[PDB]
Symmetry: D2
């Protein structure tokens, strides 16, 4: 079972299945993929769409003539397959000119170039039908404390995002921005290192409604944080515009394993949350097939991403549908959590003797939360050991 179809909204970056396997300590183990081939292979696997950095699709430094040629080839493949392009992004991290950042480089001329490079790819993204434009500021940061005045850097980051918002507004584009946080790597510390920091920063931009977050499973886990909790906070704020699914084993370098690998229980609770909240954006995989693999392993790893999502969706749905779990949720008072604490108001609460003066603290304290029985029912459903 568990066969993916375009309705499941699975998407992949060109840079994922196309990663050649160069890491900090070793050369490439796979040949370069033609983006046209990736589109066609991904359509056959059941993918909904692909995403791209500008430099994935058009080699850096291409003339206007070579650029048009690369885009026409790619567009021809999309038209042939029905594959969509729901998101695009800029590469502001690979070329040595960005070694101190794009939007927050100390050199002003680099920051201006960073903005012009980004604006050019927004035009292309809109033409191809992208609804979300992601920014991962992988070089915005520092290895040493004196290298970056962070208040000034946040001024420059705000300036850049405000100029991008003025640009899409003046052009009448119907595209929104999503900031992708990462705590570190390749810089010693990266600015806006978590979902929370990015959410707070958005609230100081001139047009906050145009901006949300693109959280990545492995990135929040690189700070030891609870990724489903962070996603819940983004949904609560109305800012989950896009999401990057993959796996990560704890606090270390960014692994970008296939989704389902790494923290399996966190993946179950994430899928439970996305599906119960009715998230309807792309389920995008930002993963790297390990460099141990040949090209057959690349496609097996990509298929595995989708398969694991579909298995977890089924288990989470069965968990929530189980009357025994519904009873367990009531026994742990999850339903009381949904009731207002004091809809009767501040005055009524102050004069309520049963909330303080006459509150029986020892009886309340003796009540068990029954959380372990609930969690073991969740474990049983995840493992298919109910029945």
């Amino acid at each position: 079972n568990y066969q993916p179809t375009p309705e499941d909204r699975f998407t992949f970056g060109l840079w994922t299945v196309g990663w050649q396997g160069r890491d900090p300590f070793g050369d490439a183990t796979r040949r370069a993929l033609d983006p046209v081939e990736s589109v066609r292979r991904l359509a056959e696997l059941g993918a909904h769409g692909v995403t791209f950095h500008d430099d994935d699709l058009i080699p850096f430094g291409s003339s206007d003539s070579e650029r048009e040629e690369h885009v026409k080839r790619f567009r021809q493949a999309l038209d042939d397959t029905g594959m969509k392009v729901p998101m695009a992004t800029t590469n502001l991290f690979t070329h040595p000119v960005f070694k101190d950042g794009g939007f927050t480089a100390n050199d002003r001329d680099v920051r201006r170039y960073a903005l012009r490079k980004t604006i050019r790819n927004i035009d292309l993204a809109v033409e191809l039908g992208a609804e979300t434009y992601v920014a991962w500021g992988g070089r915005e940061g520092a290895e040493s404390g004196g290298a970056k005045d962070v208040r000034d850097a946040l001024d420059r980051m705000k300036e850049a995002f405000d100029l991008l918002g003025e640009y899409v507004t003046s052009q009448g584009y119907d595209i929104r921005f999503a900031i992708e946080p990462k705590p570190n790597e390749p810089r010693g510390d990266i600015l806006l290192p978590t979902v929370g920091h990015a959410l707070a920063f958005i609230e100081r931009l001139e047009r906050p409604e145009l901006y949300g977050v693109n959280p990545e499973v492995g990135h929040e886990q690189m700070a030891g944080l609870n990724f489903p909790h962070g996603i819940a906070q983004a949904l609560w704020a109305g800012k989950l515009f896009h999401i990057d699914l993959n796996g990560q084993n704890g606090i270390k370098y960014d692994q970008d394993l296939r989704f389902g690998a790494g923290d399996l229980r966190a993946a179950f609770w994430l899928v439970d949350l996305l599906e119960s909240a009715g998230y309807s954006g792309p389920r995008h995989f930002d993963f790297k097939p390990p460099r141990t693999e040949d090209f057959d392993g690349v496609w097996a790893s990509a298929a595995g991403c989708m398969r694991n999502y579909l298995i977890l969706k089924e288990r989470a749905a069965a968990f929530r549908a189980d009357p025994e779990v519904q009873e367990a949720l009531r026994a742990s008072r999850l339903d009381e959590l949904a009731r207002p604490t004091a809809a009767d108001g501040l005055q009524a609460l102050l004069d309520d003797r049963s909330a303080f003066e006459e509150f029986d603290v020892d009886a309340a304290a003796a009540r068990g939360m029954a959380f372990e029985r609930l969690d073991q029912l969740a474990m049983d459903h995840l493992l298919g050991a109910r029945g």
Copy 2:
């Protein structure tokens, strides 16, 4: 040298020097301190003031008569010494009734009790002259994924803080709230786990101007984050109302070492930032004298907190005053970071051929940032090896 005086604004919680040394694996190693003794001993060391949880000062469950007696004794000590009380907080974590939280407990009656307990201590805090009321939601969280619906929990957290804001507003109190984040411990994950998450949450409250953050050095470091960077972002947003200084060696249990211990370079860059930004709130120490120590070691550890701040202040001031460092800052273009990227505007930037069409990317890329020479000058100043 480095003798502290009240003008340095050093403050200590009653619960810091008063920690009896009970940890998860062992009994208390020190006798309980009388809060009156702590006030007098801290005044002799040069402290500006003390802070308190309600339960530090008034034993839980005290009658109105015993309560008034504990407060009069404490007030008499403050009047005798001139010690100030700039901040207070609620204990919503020790008593078993709070085992699933205060503001976000699943049980509604517990949430109501949590609010009444907090409101009662706000009245006392204002009477004693506190300007900041801190909330550390140490029990708000979960060990397992199904125990807490996080969107509902954030609704209840918002409800509680909005009711506290309505209360201080209706009473005409001149006190502000500061949320203290912590990523984990004693819960498996705590809600609002970092400075960023707390800053983002404040922006959804009804009266955001009343609320800021109380970041703690060790807590951000428990997520492997850069504490000076996080403080810079709080200052940039106008939300650094208070701060907890201590030390922490990496990602593990919350150590609350004396300030200066743990990550020494991060402490240098923090002091550099607080002093150059002109932060003027209390320099509050939330630390625990290790349970290896007797009472002489408690006071030596407390004196060490203040001493290390004063030494780092001197080194950071000398670093910024050094003409050789000023030259190094220009060589790394820290001054260009302060210039707007495009004050000429979006249209001018789009038509500027030198920002893209004619931008010499290879010349820009070849420029060294000279960050290592700058950082070694910082190291030399920290270690007193200049000259």
Copy 3:
């Protein structure tokens, strides 16, 4: 299904189901359990046996008369139920006298007391039938660099273990020692912090054959290490005398969650390894029912430990029995890993032109390892989605 019976060799510490819920920030949430009740409740759940610290069974400071009374009660419960006692240990961490360690306290008189306290419990352990005596040196360590000369401390640690080996040898006891590592908590750093460090230390003792390791799942994961890999190395060295099973979510305070919780895939690979290696010692649970729970939750959490082991055993057995997985193992050359590299010898290897001079490095490099397909078959078996 998945009902435990005594043949599954599941054991529990008295201190596990008996944890009253006191953590660093809160009071106890459960009443104390009578060890006799724990024996009887654990026998009803299907447990094989119980383990104990001296101070769990005999309150500290008991006279010879009260001591004999506590032991007779406990012995009567064991005889009534058939429950076994396969392991015992000393509490050298709770009482304030041990605040700087037992075997490596700076104070010599404390080290002597630590040895006499331990020797007394070895006598009792042997009388009750224990085959393994565990030592967890939770207080051996330091918060600051100058407090402990670590070479001298390792001398004292070696001295203590050598004296214990001389004692059991002179008494003719048939009991072996197992060192339990932990990287930190309650000390800032603990000596012998991982399985590897403990294995290396054993090799410098006078009688290494008497000593092995008692690794704990969560403890190695507190250093971000791969617990199955560490267990493999202990088995390879012949030193896995005992094991502590529980769960842990990443690098933070020691959670001691029920087994199966935390890193679920690591638990699958651990059970796969223990069962395929034919480990035949106790499957011991060192876990804490969360303090949110009442007494019903305590027993549900304990039952969950055993249930999760039995489910994972079934899935791992089905994984290894699957002919499709056996084919995948050959495709990834797991079988070639078992062949000697050069049983033909050093001289033959030096003169083998096909190992270097004529080795086709590009053909070898192009071979895929097929690891992702293998790992997805493992995922399918863990989740019960094969068929």
Copy 4:
């Protein structure tokens, strides 16, 4: 002051100052350095010697004729400068053929090639005067649990090191091996991940006397471990053959910052330990000048490594020479830690009533350890604030 000279025994890998700045997300920012230039520039800075991987000095796949040419050029530079070559190593990680390991690749032909490549460089290393041959098994490991049978892999690792020991023994070379641990990166988990694991493994080799450890500051810190403690254990076992000095900020990707950067207090305690133990091997820097830097920054970063060692040496010497610190060491009973616990023997200890029956546990427990005052004296000396 703090000028390095050859007597300080500072050494650098060719791959350190020669790192071109390629990281997982970006291209090279510096041109390649000619090894002859690196020798001459390092001699001018005051370095004692250089180290190399085979592939740093001889491009992979070179004929016997090109190989001899590269070696003669390098040898001519050494003879011209007096620079020594105290250590060499093999590159078994960069070429795609090693994507699953060298000594523990699943493919047997790769393991044989790995051994022949290593043996060839041992011959060259001895000819140039190296006394230590390092092995960093950076590709020995796995991203997924089924890919590697770790017991079989340790068999193959033991086989390889035993064959290398047979080879140097049969040739009569006076060179010893040092294993360099790393917990992860570039593999998801690396075999022998810490100093402890490597020390334990050495004890199972046929000729353990030929093998020790080459611990790296940042690598142990990637597991959150205390690097000075681990070095103490290696010295206690007689196995510290070599050491890699650099800096690392906590648990994340391997940063290889210049020595002194990262955890500054840990660097102070390390230098204190190396100097008080009389370690006399090379002080080798395995660091990467950040890719933000041009070639002037490369040499400033390299000079900074040596400068920071010399400053910390001076501060640690002054700390130990201070009569006030000696008094503090006695007050914390560091001297009692050096006394045997029970040189009177097991029988005397058993019959000593003052060690148990008459031991006054409450008086002992009340003694303060005075560790905080000692640590603040250490802080004062590190910062040059004594006097």
